[PDB]
Symmetry: D2
Subunit: 259 residues, 4 copies
């Protein structure tokens, strides 16, 4: 009797029990959804299979979003298991290391730009288009963004451009798919404290700053992002589309650091 009972949801981007996708998966499973997962490379098949089993699922599929052949095969494969798809979680992003460090121009190249936008922005509407023939009429598609799309954040650089494109794709997708009934939204998530992420020194300084300056004086967790994601994927949110919802302890709404 959870608020996602019977909904069939495909999640990308599950790499560990610290992934945002893992938090979303937990909340969706808690609320009654049936889950399926994608992975990148045969070397990760066994590990994603273990995660799927944790969520009562045997449905895992390769999908390197850099490759048309894998996008164009993903939903043909899923269709042999599920007549229709109710939810899609796009939790994927990448840019070369030099493009998200230091000076924006020093780290700028055409290939760095191309890759960042290809993986981090194009892949969301690309997956939506490949899924369309088996989407339920009231399906819900969800992607993940970050405040660096809206305002300049140190080091975020080329990923900020790609996330702005991603957030625009939410709006154009919502129009394209909305007459059928499909909703499309993003969560603009705050930084997440994990063991490895805190080791990244510049990222830890952001965490500390958000902790000191966000309205709630605390960083968000994957359970809080996961719950917001489960809401947007559900019929509870049937009035909500083309929205970029901040789940960031309110950080986006202030000018911090001046008190």
């Amino acid at each position: 009797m959870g608020f996602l009972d019977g909904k069939r949801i495909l999640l990308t981007g599950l790499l560990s029990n610290r992934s945002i996708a893992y938090g979303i998966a937990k909340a969706c499973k808690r609320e009654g959804a049936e889950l399926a997962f994608t992975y990148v490379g045969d070397r990760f098949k066994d590990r994603i299979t273990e995660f799927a089993a944790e969520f009562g699922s045997e449905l895992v599929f390769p999908c390197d979003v850099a490759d048309d052949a894998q996008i164009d095969a993903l939903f043909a494969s899923l269709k042999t298991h599920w007549d229709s798809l109710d939810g899609l979680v796009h939790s994927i992003g990448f840019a070369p290391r030099e493009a998200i460090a230091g000076d924006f121009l020093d780290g700028l190249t055409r290939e760095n730009f191309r890759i960042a936008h290809d993986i981090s922005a194009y892949s969301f509407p690309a997956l939506a288009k490949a899924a369309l023939p088996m989407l339920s009429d009231d399906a819900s598609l969800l992607t993940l963004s970050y405040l660096g799309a809206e305002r300049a954040i140190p080091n975020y650089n080329t990923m900020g451009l790609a996330k702005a494109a991603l957030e625009a794709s939410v709006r154009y997708l919502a129009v394209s798919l909305g007459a059928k009934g499909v909703r499309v939204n993003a969560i603009s998530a705050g930084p997440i404290k994990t063991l490895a992420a805190s080791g990244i020194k510049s990222f830890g300084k952001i965490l500390d700053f958000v902790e000191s300056n966000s309205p709630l004086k605390r960083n968000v967790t994957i359970e809080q992002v996961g719950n917001a994601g489960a809401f947007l994927l559900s019929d509870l949110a049937s009035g909500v589309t083309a929205e970029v919802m901040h789940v960031d302890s309110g950080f986006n709404a202030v000018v911090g650091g001046m008190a």
Copy 2:
């Protein structure tokens, strides 16, 4: 177990079973919350008592937000029933008719401006301030706004100004109350179709034709989003103005 199980929530602005506050009330009660209600004027005591009964509550209190004493007396009274308050729904707005019809300047007077901002904007942080001594550390405060705060919409006029101030108060309230743990948000709702004004019918038709989902929102949809924001499911969400409007805010419609 509903996702508001045990939460004690005060709702203002419940006038009819087509109110947005009605949809929010229904969704909160569905998810296990205990409700209390305000009303304006002794003549409406019976009607609000009936509504509270529908939601299993006997807690109704007068509160004209134009009156400082009634705002203070509201929470003094509620405190004898509830040790702490977990939610507040602000569904209150008003401007004199001429200030929300026709040309913006034609309906502009100092008193029309004053009333619209007093009732529709000041009352939200005023209620929050009076409630603060009994708010739980996890409390959630919710108000209702409209796209006319962000862009100029025909006839909305002076209410567009007041709603912009209201949405700003959401951000300043979130800062003032957030260290304690209290969250503050607004829902920017689309128009709600009931049994009217030729100008309002034109807006409803236009939203149905031009919104991404090609349909107007219902009080059930706004209510479910409200229940979410009032709940621990939304513990990461504060200072947010969430559009519940079939996506209408995100397009340039009509072309």
Copy 3:
């Protein structure tokens, strides 16, 4: 010659040679405009008359925007000298001190809220309405706002609400007056170096803005002159940031 040649512009809010209105007045005069000024209260009549003379003007008028009668009498008096008005600069703002210091709720009262919104927001469309019978078809109306309307800034508090209402009034005014041809805009100015908390903000902006410097009244003045001029004839309903880019960044996290 200058790009405001022959334009007749009324400026409010000139209190000193540090005022934003003084910087706007200097830029407008530099570009050929004819200027007139308002003042608040009989005690300031001599001081505004001295400032007006610096700009080659003898046109000064009382206008306490709290008073309906002074707003109405202002444009009757101005019409005696000027058949039409080409520009209006609204540089007026006030909130009781407690409402713009400390905690937002600590300083919140109904009367503090009322005054802040009456003086800082209502007065702009009020002046526009009273000016309309004599506005030229290509007049330009300009007000001043601040980033605290858009995001929560420490201590700005009730003024943030009033400036949000003001920026909304820019849009509704633009629609009301636009068919005639009148344009309506705001400048969201950065803080002007001229309080311990205010110094903290100035330091933060200088350290974290893209241009690594606070703005001057000269820079706000030139942007204002631009918006008041035919160079900006395609621009209305705009809130233009003149703030060294500060609004566009998340500072302090290095």
Copy 4:
């Protein structure tokens, strides 16, 4: 003297007397600037040379921004005439036609997406980076965007994504170049078949009840390129008769 007197400004995207770049060129020249121009394709060398002479200039350079080598050669060549560059006008945009007509998903392919973002977004910071060694400390860089970056506009489709990335590049460029003193801004211009329907709608529904002209965009651009705008950076300025600020069609 004009408010751009002596400023040396390079303009891209001048294809005809209807180009936004032509309106900016005319205003900049009126205000005393010295101009240089780029062009694409040897077949257009004559046409751009005529435009340069109209504005009292002999300085024209080939630059297809799809090609790293042409971007690098552009500023190497320009440096043999100008020791420093005071202004740059990026007025370049392209997507394959099917990506900006009809339904958003019908025109969406990896290669259409790549081209639209390559030409319409990457090229602005690419040019900025190649120009940097010769940019004056107080130089001003200007790009052109459109409301489709902010809200979904019919048919604009993949170009809406690319313009959103472009407007973000304005903000990251302003941070990167700002300590030096360089300013970076965009003008979100109103529109200048399904396109004529949009012009009618904007004329009927914008606050000023009229479409913008390249003269109005050009004067706003000259302002942003000048020291009058020395307090302004990282800004996207709407020059669109107020259209961005309303919900039209409902009256």
